[PDB]
Structure formats: C-alpha cells, structure tokens
Design an enzyme around this catalytic site. Structure first.
Site, short mmCIF file in Angstrom:
data_model
loop_
_atom_site.label_atom_id
_atom_site.label_comp_id
_atom_site.label_asym_id
_atom_site.label_seq_id
_atom_site.Cartn_x
_atom_site.Cartn_y
_atom_site.Cartn_z
N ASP A 129 -19.54 9.99 -18.33
CA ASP A 129 -20.36 8.82 -18.75
C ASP A 129 -21.85 9.31 -18.94
OD1 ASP A 129 -20.13 5.65 -18.74
OD2 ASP A 129 -22.00 6.23 -17.66
N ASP B 103 -24.80 7.39 -18.78
CA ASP B 103 -25.66 6.72 -17.79
C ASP B 103 -25.38 6.15 -16.60
OD1 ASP B 103 -24.06 4.46 -18.43
OD2 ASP B 103 -25.70 3.27 -19.53
N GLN C 299 -23.70 3.99 -15.29
CA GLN C 299 -23.40 2.46 -15.34
C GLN C 299 -21.90 2.45 -15.94
OE1 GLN C 299 -26.17 0.92 -14.02
NE2 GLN C 299 -26.69 3.06 -13.85
N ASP D 236 -4.18 -2.41 -2.37
CA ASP D 236 -2.89 -1.91 -1.94
C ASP D 236 -1.91 -1.03 -2.47
OD1 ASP D 236 -2.35 -4.10 -3.54
OD2 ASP D 236 -1.34 -5.31 -2.19
N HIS E 293 -0.66 2.72 -1.60
CA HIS E 293 0.48 2.96 -1.69
C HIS E 293 0.69 4.32 -2.50
CE1 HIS E 293 4.67 1.62 -2.68
NE2 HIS E 293 4.74 2.55 -3.70
N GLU E 294 0.03 4.47 -3.43
CA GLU E 294 0.19 5.61 -4.22
C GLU E 294 -0.20 6.99 -3.50
OE1 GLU E 294 2.25 5.37 -6.62
OE2 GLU E 294 1.59 3.16 -7.02
N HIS F 164 2.12 8.02 -0.84
CA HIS F 164 3.21 8.97 -1.37
C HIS F 164 2.83 10.36 -0.94
CE1 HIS F 164 6.26 6.14 -2.83
NE2 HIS F 164 5.42 5.27 -3.57
N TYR G 124 13.54 10.80 -2.24
CA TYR G 124 13.09 9.70 -2.69
C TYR G 124 14.64 8.99 -3.37
CZ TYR G 124 10.08 6.08 -5.22
OH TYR G 124 9.43 5.11 -5.66
N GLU H 242 9.28 4.37 0.54
CA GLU H 242 8.58 3.12 -0.18
C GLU H 242 8.03 2.24 0.72
OE1 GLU H 242 7.74 1.84 -3.10
OE2 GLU H 242 7.85 3.88 -3.44
N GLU I 119 1.57 -9.23 1.24
CA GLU I 119 1.83 -9.05 0.05
C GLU I 119 1.52 -7.95 -0.78
OE1 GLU I 119 3.77 -11.97 -1.23
OE2 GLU I 119 3.89 -11.95 1.06
N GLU J 227 -0.37 -8.32 -5.52
CA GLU J 227 -0.60 -9.85 -5.77
C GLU J 227 -2.08 -9.61 -6.74
OE1 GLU J 227 -0.77 -8.55 -2.75
OE2 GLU J 227 -3.24 -8.45 -2.24
N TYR K 264 -0.54 -8.27 -10.26
CA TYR K 264 0.75 -8.73 -11.09
C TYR K 264 0.62 -10.00 -11.74
CZ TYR K 264 5.76 -9.44 -10.41
OH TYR K 264 6.87 -9.46 -10.73
N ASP L 229 17.62 2.24 -9.33
CA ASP L 229 16.35 2.31 -8.63
C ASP L 229 16.38 3.50 -7.52
OD1 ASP L 229 13.48 1.69 -7.96
OD2 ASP L 229 14.42 0.21 -6.30
N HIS M 90 12.93 0.46 -3.90
CA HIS M 90 11.88 -0.70 -4.07
C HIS M 90 12.68 -1.84 -3.60
CE1 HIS M 90 10.20 2.54 -6.73
NE2 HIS M 90 9.12 2.01 -6.40
#
Ligand SMILES: CC(C)C[C@H](NP(=O)(O)CNC(=O)OCc1ccccc1)C(=O)NC[C@H](C)C(C)C
Ligand SMILES: [Ca+2]
Ligand SMILES: [Ca+2]
Ligand SMILES: [Ca+2]
Ligand SMILES: [Ca+2]
Ligand SMILES: [Zn+2]
Length: 316
Positions: A57, A59, A61, A138, A142-143, A146, A157, A166, A187, A190, A193, A226, A231
C-alpha cells in the site's frame, strides 16, 4: 521483507476503524513485526494461486473497500497470536514463533476459508451466504487453530477425529472472540454469515440443533458427506464444551459450569498433551478428564463438570 515497523490505519469488513502493524520499505506492507517472526497478509487477487503477493500500500491508510478483508485478516491474526501467547504461553501455531501467513480475495464468490497446510486462506463470499470471511474474529481464530491442531494432536480430518478437530477450532475461535470482548457469543460466524438475515449464524455451540447439527451422540451423522460429518458432528463436542463453561441441563443431565477460562485450560491441555491423530469422542472425554485432573485435582468440581457434560451429550 526488510524494513522498519510502522502503524497504519484502516477499516475492516464491518466498517470499524483499527490500527494495523505494517512494514515500510518503499511501500507499506501488511507485515507485523511485533509478534513472533511476523504476521504477513497477501493479496490473492481473486485467483487461486497461493499465497499471492505480500500486500503493498502506498500511503499506510487502508480505507478502500478492497482493503477491508486484508485489514481484518491481519488484525485478527494478531489478536489470535496474543490469545495463544498470553493465555496459553504458546508462541504461534508451532510453538516456536512460526511466521503467520494469510491470503485474502481468494477465488471469486468463495463461501469458505481454510488452512491449506501452510497458511490461512479467505474467500470474499458471494454477498449472499457470506461477506468476506476474515471479518469474523471467530472465523480467523478458527482457521489459525487448525494450524495449532495440525502441529499438536494432529487430528485426522475425517469422522470422529475430524469432528474433534472442527470443535477445537470452534471452541478456540469462540474463546478468542471472548478475549477480544466485542459482541462475544457462543455462535460461529455470525458477523460474516448471511448479510440479509439478522440473528443467525453458521453454527451454534449453545444450541447446535438450531442450525441442523447434533447435540447428542445418538444423533451423530454416520454418512460420508463432509468428510464423515466433521462440520456436523462437531456440534456434539461444541455442546459439551459450552456446558462445561456455562452449565445447563441437557436431556435431563445437569452440568455445573466452571467458566470459559477453565474450559480453555482443560481443552488446551487435552489438545497438546493427550489427543492423538486418531482420537475418537470417547478418547476426548478421557483426555479432558485427565487434563482437568492434572490442573484441578481428581476430587475437583472441574473434573465432575467435565464428566457431567460428556454424559449430557451421550459420550462415555
Ligand atoms: C468458520 C467457518 C466460517 C469456516 C470453516 N472453514 P474450515 O473448517 O477451515 C474448511 N476447511 C476445509 O474444508 O479444509 C479441507 C482442507 C483440507 C486440507 C487442505 C486444505 C483444505 C467452516 O466451518 N467451513 C464449513 C463451510 C462453510 C461449509 C459449512
Ligand atoms: Ca492506501
Ligand atoms: Ca459475536
Ligand atoms: Ca461468534
Ligand atoms: Ca446473517
Ligand atoms: Zn474448520
């Protein structure tokens, strides 16, 4: 890149202003030198080649619409690093301050995020099911969790070990959300989503069945979709974790809550000292009981509550 540490300012996915740690060398880069061996955020430019280019970037900002997912991936990776270091004395995902890398603007209309074995990856969503997924603290936690799992227990997995994998990511994603203390809840997802639907979320830990997921072992999914329901069946473990922390009576079984901090200590110890790649739900119960015993003693309320919570969700 080699440069000097700087502090930029910008706006995240939800429109909120925040400061970000950057590095200056001709451009300002999304490279935070203040944490471990750095946090690095990349532009995938709507393509699927990874990582893409380190975010540059002119500047310092970061108020453009295109910047917002990068701001949040970078900033929330920092919060997650801080949680693990300050709460669990863990230095990055490998315990040795590995550099943390994330790419945003992955693919087109991409309604998911993932750890690819080496880095975090965030879609922008299609604007209907998701907005850019790094807007959820969250989700980011979460990622990154892992990666922690992969370096520690190594839960495969699929099937029960994958549902534990998970749930660990949802549990720590939620504990990081509480650590930051902005609109925290039990939750998942949220904030990013279904922008056209208020009050919903991708999963619920307090009531998994609200979003289709089982809240008792007798309701587990046994098919092959899945990865064997990773999940889906995570709801059984998410519910147990919620009950350990918050208490409740579930299918007639009462659980005395012990609070979030003790939940986190118990599950972090189980993840790092007892779980293995092939652990199943029954083995998770045993690991959690042993972890609580180590931390609080065999006669403690904490051990009793772990047992009650797993009883409540039908896991012996
Ligand atoms: C918190 C959520 C908003 C995001 C979270 N993403 P994840 O679990 O990290 C997805 N990872 C995944 O599939 O890894 C497969 C794999 C395995 C190896 C290498 C590469 C990839 C999730 O719950 N996704 C479920 C979908 C939305 C549907 C529902
Ligand atoms: Ca700029
Ligand atoms: Ca929230
Ligand atoms: Ca949440
Ligand atoms: Ca929504
Ligand atoms: Zn996941």
């Amino acid at each position: 890149i080699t440069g000097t540490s700087t502090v930029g300012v910008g706006r995240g996915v939800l429109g909120d202003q925040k400061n970000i740690n950057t590095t200056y060398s001709t451009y300002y880069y999304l490279q935070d030198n203040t944490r471990g061996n750095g946090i690095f955020t990349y532009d995938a430019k709507y393509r699927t080649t990874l990582p893409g280019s380190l975010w540059a970037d002119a500047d310092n900002q970061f108020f453009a619409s295109y910047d917002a997912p990068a701001v949040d991936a970078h900033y929330y990776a920092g919060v997650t690093y801080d949680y693990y270091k300050n709460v669990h004395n863990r230095l990055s995902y490998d315990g040795n301050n590995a550099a943390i890398r994330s790419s945003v603007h992955y693919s087109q209309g991409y309604n998911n995020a993932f750890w690819n074995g080496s880095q975090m990856v965030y879609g922008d969503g299609d604007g209907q099911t998701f907005i850019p997924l790094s807007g959820g603290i969250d989700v980011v936690a979460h990622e990154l969790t892992h990666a922690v799992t992969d370096y520690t227990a190594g839960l495969i997995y699929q099937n029960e070990s994958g549902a534990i994998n998970e749930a660990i990511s949802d549990i720590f994603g939620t504990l990081v959300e509480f650590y930051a203390n902005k609109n925290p809840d039990w939750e998942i997802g949220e904030d990013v989503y279904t922008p056209g639907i208020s009050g919903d979320s991708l999963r619920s830990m307090s009531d998994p069945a609200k979003y289709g997921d089982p809240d008792h072992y007798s309701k587990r999914y046994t098919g092959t979709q899945d990865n064997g329901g990773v999940h889906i069946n995570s709801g059984i473990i998410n519910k147990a974790a919620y009950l350990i922390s918050q208490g409740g009576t579930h299918y007639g079984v009462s659980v005395v809550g012990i609070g979030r901090d003790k939940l986190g200590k118990i599950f972090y110890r189980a993840l790092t000292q007892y779980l293995t790649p092939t652990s199943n739900f029954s083995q998770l119960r045993a690991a959690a009981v042993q972890s609580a015993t180590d931390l609080y003693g065999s006669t403690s309320q904490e051990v009793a509550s772990v047992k009650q919570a797993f009883d409540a969700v039908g896991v012996k």
